[PDB]
Write a protein that binds this ligand. Structure first.
Ligand SMILES: [Cl-]
Ligand SMILES: [Cl-]
Length: 162
């Protein structure tokens, strides 16, 4: 198991424009196209990301490319963020994946806002962090995915994904 397999599980794979849990236009493996309500605007964003006239449909390879870019970006975002970097540096490899997962889903800004949880993680207070993380809109809106991630922070192993 690794970050890619982990996210592929959490996000799934769709080759056609779709709406995410929040009702936003997305495609591939969790690749958000736009928060705007127009399907047109989404199609425009799609064509621009892929470099061609897609008509809202992409290939698996194209999806995978968008995915690698997105993973890369999340990592780099973590590394560039003053609040995140220190946490990420302090974690073991499996837990780092968990943090990356959160960033991929909610963005740098979003997770950097989990001040208290971040501190607990940094202190290696697993169980406490787990409870604090659960007190969130995130957990309440996407509970199954949140449990998976939370369990991964709590145990440091991949069992929630096996
Ligand atoms: Cl892009
Ligand atoms: Cl869920």
């Amino acid at each position: 198991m690794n970050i890619f397999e982990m996210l592929r599980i959490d996000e799934g794979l769709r080759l056609k424009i779709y709406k995410d849990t929040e009702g936003y236009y997305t495609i591939g493996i969790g690749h958000l196209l736009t928060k705007s309500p127009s399907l047109n605007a989404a199609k425009s964003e799609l064509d621009k990301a892929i470099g061609r006239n897609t008509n809202g449909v992409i290939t698996k390879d194209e999806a995978e490319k968008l995915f690698n870019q997105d993973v890369d970006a999340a990592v780099r975002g973590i590394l560039r963020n003053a609040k995140l970097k220190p946490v990420y540096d302090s974690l073991d490899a499996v837990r780092r994946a968990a943090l990356i997962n959160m960033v991929f889903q909610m963005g740098e800004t979003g997770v950097a806002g989990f001040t208290n949880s971040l501190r607990m993680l940094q202190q290696k207070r697993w169980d406490e962090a787990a409870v604090n993380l659960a007190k969130s809109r995130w957990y309440n809106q996407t509970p199954n995915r949140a449990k998976r991630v939370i369990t991964t922070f709590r145990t440091g192993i991949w069992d929630a994904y096996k």
